[PDB]
Amino acid sequence: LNLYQKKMKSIVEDFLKRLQIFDISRVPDDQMYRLRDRLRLLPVEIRRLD
Amino acid sequence: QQFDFRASMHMLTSNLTFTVYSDLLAFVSADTVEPINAVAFDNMRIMNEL
Numbered sequence: 001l002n003l004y005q006k007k008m009k010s011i012v013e014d015f016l017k018r019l020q021i022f023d024i025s026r027v028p029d030d031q032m033y034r035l036r037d038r039l040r041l042l043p044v045e046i047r048r049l050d
Numbered sequence: 051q052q053f054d055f056r057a058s059m060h061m062l063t064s065n066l067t068f069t070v071y072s073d074l075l076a077f078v079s080a081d082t083v084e085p086i087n088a089v090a091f092d093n094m095r096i097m098n099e100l
Contacts, residue, residue, distance in 0.1 A: 005086060008100050033099065 012036050 012032040016022050043049075088096040 004100070007086075 008036055009033065012039075015039075 009029055009032060012035045013024060015035070016027070016032070017024050086097075090096045
């Protein structure tokens, strides 16, 4: 989708949140990105993809 | 020295109607892309960790 502007610092945030326990604001943007870096290589679930 | 008209009468070569400018530059109209879109010799994109 070439969204060179929907700076992803976005998705990671929500992600973590949805599994309460983690104090989001209280975790550096860093770890977060690295979190995306790993997510990216993950297969959607047929459902999702399809 | 005695005074001899003839020889003291000279003609005058002068240009006519200028307009001197300083500062210069100013005449330059210039804007800027939005920061999120930079590039170096690279041309791929400076600052590119979305």
